Design an enzyme around this catalytic site. Sequence first.
Site, PDB file in Angstrom:
ATOM      1  N   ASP A  35      35.240  83.539  45.889  1.00 60.04           N
ATOM      2  CA  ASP A  35      35.429  82.244  45.259  1.00 60.04           C
ATOM      3  C   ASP A  35      36.866  82.066  44.769  1.00 60.04           C
ATOM      4  O   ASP A  35      37.218  82.547  43.697  1.00 60.04           O
ATOM      5  CB  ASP A  35      34.456  82.134  44.081  1.00 60.04           C
ATOM      6  CG  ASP A  35      34.554  80.801  43.367  1.00 60.04           C
ATOM      7  OD1 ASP A  35      35.191  79.883  43.918  1.00 60.04           O
ATOM      8  OD2 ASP A  35      33.968  80.671  42.262  1.00 60.04           O
ATOM      9  N   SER A 199      48.003  67.510  48.770  1.00 59.99           N
ATOM     10  CA  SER A 199      47.927  67.022  50.132  1.00 59.99           C
ATOM     11  C   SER A 199      48.768  65.757  50.266  1.00 59.99           C
ATOM     12  O   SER A 199      48.898  64.974  49.332  1.00 59.99           O
ATOM     13  CB  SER A 199      46.471  66.750  50.506  1.00 59.99           C
ATOM     14  OG  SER A 199      46.348  66.096  51.756  1.00 59.99           O
TER      15      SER A 199
END
Length: 330
Positions: A35, A199
């Site tokens: 994770d 992004s």
Amino acid sequence: STGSATTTPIDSLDDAYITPVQIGTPAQTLNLDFDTGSSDLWVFSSETTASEVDGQTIYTPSKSTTAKLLSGATWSISYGDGSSSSGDVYTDTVSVGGLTVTGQAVESAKKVSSSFTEDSTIDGLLGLAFSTLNTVSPTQQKTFFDNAKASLDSPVFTADLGYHAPGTYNFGFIDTTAYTGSITYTAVSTKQGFWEWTSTGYAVGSGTFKSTSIDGIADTGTTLLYLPATVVSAYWAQVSGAKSSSSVGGYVFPCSATLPSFTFGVGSARIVIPGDYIDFGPISTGSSSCFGGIQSSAGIGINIFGDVALKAAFVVFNGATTPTLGFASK
């Protein structure tokens, strides 16, 4: 040193991925959920409340000659999905794919929430976010990666998750045969303890690319792709009959649909998520309404590039002095 381990979807939907981890001496192999959005290595154990164990493999520290109780240490964690676990702490030898750390904090669960109990395939979590998020008190502990880093050939790990197929976590090297083209690296903020990046935009299907900054986290422990409501609405508008269902808890779509791809930007590069990766199947057995793999982050407070996004790429978690993230197509 290096390590390389195969990671395997837990079910036919890729709801999560498990990777075998050797703990203790002699080794006890547990299948952990790696994770990159958390920083605790915790396991089902011989200390876990019996009624909360249902099929998981447990760590029994009393059977490990290298286990030592970390005196006075406790831990307690709550995850974004509302699940939680807590317990005490041992140090022990932990190996992943041939890479060994001695003295790793292994957090032994005394209590786990129902969602963990109900998932027989996940024996615990191995956190790979920054150690500043580790919950051990009163002395915070380091992640497996943080402990291994100095020994690694290069201070990196990579995630290469499969779509409905196994994939690989590598530590200490970049497998140049595992991706196509080049890896595009992008800046990381560690201010929130995550692999947080920005992004450069998105496209839906064959549509034009929208240049827009989307701050979010690379999170292997989250199944879906969570993005701003504007972006998610633009995606689902291209699927006839798709709608946001408050009763179900997100966007659903007719199972008869063919889903468009979704592209996200990494600098000037582009990662394309095929439409099929966005299908999470019937909302309940036999239903013709299917759950979407792109969902709104509104009210999460952060955008999450979870498995839906990451499995479309070869992803480098570069833990150099100034960390960065790399993405390649594959």
